[PDB]
Nucleic acid binder design. Sequence first.
DNA 1: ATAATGACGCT
DNA 2: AGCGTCAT
Length: 427
Amino acid sequence: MATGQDRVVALVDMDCFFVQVEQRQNPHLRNKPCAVVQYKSWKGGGIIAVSYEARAFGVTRSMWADDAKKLCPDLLLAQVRESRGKANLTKYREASVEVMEIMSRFAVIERASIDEAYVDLTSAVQERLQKLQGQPISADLLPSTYIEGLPQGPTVQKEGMRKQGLFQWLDSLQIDNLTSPDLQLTVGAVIVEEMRAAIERETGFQCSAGISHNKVLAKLACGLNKPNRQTLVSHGSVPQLFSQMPIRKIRSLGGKLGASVIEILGIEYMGELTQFTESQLQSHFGEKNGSWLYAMCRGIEHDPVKPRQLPKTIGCSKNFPGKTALATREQVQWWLLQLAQELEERLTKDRNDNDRVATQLVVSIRVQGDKRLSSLRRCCALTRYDAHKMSHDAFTVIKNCNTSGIQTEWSPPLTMLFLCATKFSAS
DNA sequence: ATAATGACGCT
DNA sequence: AGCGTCAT
Ligand SMILES: Cc1cn([C@@H]2OC[C@H](OP(=O)(O)OP(=O)(O)OP(=O)(O)O)[C@H]2O)c(=O)[nH]c1=O
Ligand SMILES: [Ca+2]
Ligand SMILES: [Ca+2]
């Protein structure tokens, strides 16, 4: 009877990251309702991050800045920096690399996003156990940790609830048994208290964190108490936690697959997936799905913390929505070159920082109408990091899709240009 | 007219 | 390889 408590895994999530990045750069933005915005033209810009002060008014991501200034008129606005006509997030990627470095010290991480890392803390927690002489774990070692499920049984202050739940946990603790899963979860947690404290001391950035036995519980744990907090979710808390957890809130169940688990099976919460046999599930959703599903509703999952703190593709895209769609040869060529240019700037910096080289160029477009994010996608070779070579070669491998005899103009209008660098190798 | 960006499965 | 899914 295996129960998926082999590993200790954490998901670190920087809190309102871009907002934190701007606020470190611009002290006026601190302790204030503010938001990051890109492209001022259309309705003031689309809001891509929201400080917690501004959330309290109702302001959300993707929302237009002119609309959100209706909800919050005191909303300050850091514009994203524009470069060659495209929104340029270099500031954040640099900010992210600062944090991934600190995290790289404490253990072996997987860059999830600009904002997130998974951390496999298993070997690190074994190392620290013998380095405490099996002596207890002080509450003071966990000043921002929550214990999902606790406090239980037989208090109005939010932090007062936190101590009770941590005190119940530390009390129930089997610290003589140096292989107790619940004890590990607790040691990894103190480590995360530390790595989170190191991130803040050394960059100024606060973050939230989830600690558990796999990537999926960690991510879910990480959302339980934000910001500047961390949740520990132990095996035994899974049944109650999943008891009313909506299925779509689990990483990979947020799209169509998860939708139909609700549809086919007629449930609505994650715990309800227990009652089915694995063959039942494989039969509804496939061999690998019914398997992963059957273990997941039992809180067991085994996708590993792949050690890969760097991405595997480098991509530069630009959207031309509505009346801005490109419809001329001269337009398409100009953007292919603008994208090619930031691309070589990112590419060159990759060749010297991370010591490697992309070898294939992928070109993608998307036309007016087609609801697929990508209408076309074609692979051509990538030899020198030369912006002009890449533009021309991109145009080459997509020239055969301007279905208008008039070569001056371009139909259908293109609503997207994507240039992605892949197939890296040593350098 | 939610934009940029990225990992992976399927075939 | 080319498309579809999913997440951030
Ligand atoms: C959903 C979504 C997110 N992001 C960004 O990827 C990292 C971060 O993700 P996040 O949700 O964590 O944003 P955030 O303000 O840090 O929110 P909280 O950490 O306070 O929850 C957000 O900066 C996108 O680029 N596109 C997206 O479609
Ligand atoms: Ca975040
Ligand atoms: Ca994130």
